[PDB]
Prior knowledge:
The structure is a homotrimer. Chain A is mainly beta and about 180 residues long. Chain A contains one helix and nine strands, in the order βββββββββα.
Amino acid sequence: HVQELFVYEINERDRGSPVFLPFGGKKQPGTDAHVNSLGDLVPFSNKIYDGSLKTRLGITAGLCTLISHSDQKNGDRYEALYSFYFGDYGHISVQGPYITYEDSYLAITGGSGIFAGCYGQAKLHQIIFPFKLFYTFYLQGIKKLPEALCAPCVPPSPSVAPADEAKQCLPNHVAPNFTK
Amino acid sequence: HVQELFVYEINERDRGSPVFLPFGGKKQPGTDAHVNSLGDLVPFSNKIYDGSLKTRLGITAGLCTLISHSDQKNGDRYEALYSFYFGDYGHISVQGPYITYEDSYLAITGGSGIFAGCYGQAKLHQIIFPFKLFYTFYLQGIKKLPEALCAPCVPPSPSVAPADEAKQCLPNHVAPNFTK
Amino acid sequence: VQELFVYEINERDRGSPVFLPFGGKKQAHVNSLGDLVPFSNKIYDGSLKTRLGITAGLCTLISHSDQKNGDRYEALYSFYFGDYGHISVQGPYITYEDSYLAITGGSGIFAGCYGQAKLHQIIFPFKLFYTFYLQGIKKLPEALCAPCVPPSPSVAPADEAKQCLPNHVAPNFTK
C-alpha cells in the first residue's frame, strides 16, 4: 500500500546554494539582461526536516535544468533530478518537474536503506519559492516507516521554521548520523 | 502485465531546442570545427503526440550528456535523463542511452498520475535524426491505460507528421490540459 | 535479491573525467557546489576475467570536506553490459567512503530491476567496486555470477580482458 512521508526543505542561506548557470544565453531586447530559458542549469543543495519540524534529517542534493519561462505565471519550469538524504535511514531519489509557480508530482525513482526498493510519486508544494518547500512522498514497496519519521505534521505556511533545537542540530533533534 | 504505449516526439523548431553546450571543448585538427566529445551537454525539450498522431499530449524535457562520438558509425552516444509530460494524465521519467545511429532501450524510472508506480523499459527509435523519434513504452505496474492513449498507431516512417488540428492544439485534439 | 559484482576502472584512455569548474570557487580551483563532472569508465565482471562494457553519466559536485579530504557528489549514470542490457543508478558518490545508490531501472536482462547498489572505493580515483542488490528480474546468467575477486587495492583486470580478447568479453561488449 502507500505510506505518506512529509518532509520540509529549507534553504537556510548557509550552503552556497543554489548556483545559477545562465547557459541558455537568452537576452532581453533593449536591456540585454539575462532571460531565464531552456538550458540554464541550477545545481543545489538545501536542508531537510521532518514533518513536525523538530528533527533535522539531512539534505537535498541535485541539479535542475531550466526548460521554459512563463511571463504570465511569473516563473519557470525545470526538469529536476535530486535526492533526499536522511542520515542512517538512507536516501530517496526523485526525477521530474519542478515548477516555481505551482505544485507538481515527481517520480520516486528508488532509494536506499529503509527506502531500498521504494517507488511511487512525490508531491512538491512551494511554500515560499525558493526558500521553503514541502513534500509528500507517497511511498510504495517498503517496510513500515519508523515512528520518528511519522510525527504529527505541521501544516505548511510561509512562516514555518525548524525548531531551534533542530536548526542547532542538538541531541533528540537529529536523524541518526544526519546528513551534513 | 506489460502495456505498450506508443509516442511520437517531434522537434517543431519553435522551442529554441536543443541547446548544445560544447563543454567537452574538442575541435577537429586541421579545421577547428567542433568535435562531439565526452562532456558536451544538451538540454532539450520537444513536443509529443500520441501514436495515431491525432492528439498533442505534451512535451519531453531533460538533459543529455554526450559520452562518445564514433567516426565509423557516424554518430554519438549520449546518456539521457528526461521526462515525458502528458498533461493531466501525468508524466513518465526515463534514464539511459540515446544513440544517434541506432535504436536503444531506456529504463522507465517511474511516473506520476496514471503512471504513478510505473516501471519497465522503453524502446527509442529514431525516425529522422535529429527531429523525429518514436517510442514504445513497455509499461508495468499501472492500471489499464485510457483508450485515448491507445488509438491505432500510425506506422513510423520519415514522412509521418502530426495532424493539422493536433499541431494547432485545437480543442478535441489535445490531451486534457496538455503540457505546453 | 540477486547480488551482482562489478569492477569499474578508469584506464585513462577515454578522456574521462571531464571536470567543469562551474562552482566558480578559487583558493587555484576549490571544489564546490555546482562543479559538474561528465564521466565514462570501463566495467569488468566480479572475477576480473571479462570486460563487460562501460559506465556513463554525470556527477554534480555538492560539497567539499577539508576534514575528510574529499567531496560529495550527486550522481546519475548507467552501467552498460553489451547485449545483456543496462542498469541505471541515482544517488551519492562520496570520494572518501562507501555509499548506496538507488537502482532506478534497466533494460535487457535488467528490465524492471529495482533495489540499491553499494559503491566501494578500491583506490581513489581510478578503481571502484559495486555490489548491485538486484530485485525484480529473472536469474542472472552464470557468466555474470562467477566467483568474485575480493576487493583490495592491487586488483586489476586480466590482461586478456584489458585487451578485449575472445572469451573475455561480454556479447557485443559496450565500447
